[PDB]
C-alpha cells in the first residue's frame, strides 16, 4: 500500500494561510484549512473513494486537491472558480479539456483525477530516478502549474499558485487520511 505520510511537505505558504486569516504557518496552516473543509468534503467522500479506487490514487489526495482547489465547493460560484477558468470540486481548466459532469459529480471527480494521473505519468518519465512519493508530489505541482515548471524536487512549488501548491495539497491530504479518507 502507498503510504502518503511518506510524502514530504512543508505545508502552506504565508500567502496561502490571507485565506482563512491564519497566524499558523506551514503544515499547521494546511491542517486548519483542511479541517475547515471536512464537513463539506464528507458529502463527496463516497464518490472520492470510488474514483480513487478506480484510478489507483489515494482518496485522501483527491480530497486534498478538492480542499485546495474549491474549499470542497465553498469558494465556487455555481461550480466556477479561477475567474471562470476552472470548473468543479477539482477545478478542471475548461480551456484545455471538454468538461464532463456536474460540478459536484463523480464524472467530474473522475475527470480531475485522470488529469492528475497524466501529470504524475509525465513527472515519472521526466524524473525516472525519483522515488514514487516524489513523482506523486511533482505530479500534484504540475496539476497547478504544468510539468515544465517541475524541475528540482526541492523547488517544485516555486512558480505555483501561493508558491506552495503541492506542499499544501500533500499536508491537507495527510490530514484527511487521519480523518479516515
Ligand atoms: Co499493499
From TrEMBL:
Its EC number is 3.2.1.17. The active site is at residues 69, 82. The keyword Transmembrane does not apply. GO terms for biological process: defense response to Gram-positive bacterium; killing of cells of another organism; peptidoglycan catabolic process. Transmembrane segments: none annotated. Keywords: Antimicrobial, Bacteriolytic enzyme, Glycosidase, Hydrolase, Signal. Residues 47-155 form the Transglycosylase SLT domain. It comes from the Eukaryota. The keyword Signal applies. InterPro entries: Glyco_hydro_23, Lysozyme-like_dom_sf, Transglycosylase_SLT_dom_1. CDD domains: GEWL. Pfam families: SLT (PF01464). GO terms for cellular component: extracellular region. GO terms for molecular function: lysozyme activity. It catalyses: Hydrolysis of (1->4)-beta-linkages between N-acetylmuramic acid and N-acetyl-D-glucosamine residues in a peptidoglycan and between N-acetyl-D-glucosamine residues in chitodextrins. Belongs to the glycosyl hydrolase 23 family. PANTHER family: LYSOZYME G FAMILY MEMBER, LYSOZYME G-RELATED. This is Lysozyme g. The lineage of its organism: Eukaryota, Metazoa, Chordata, Craniata, Vertebrata.
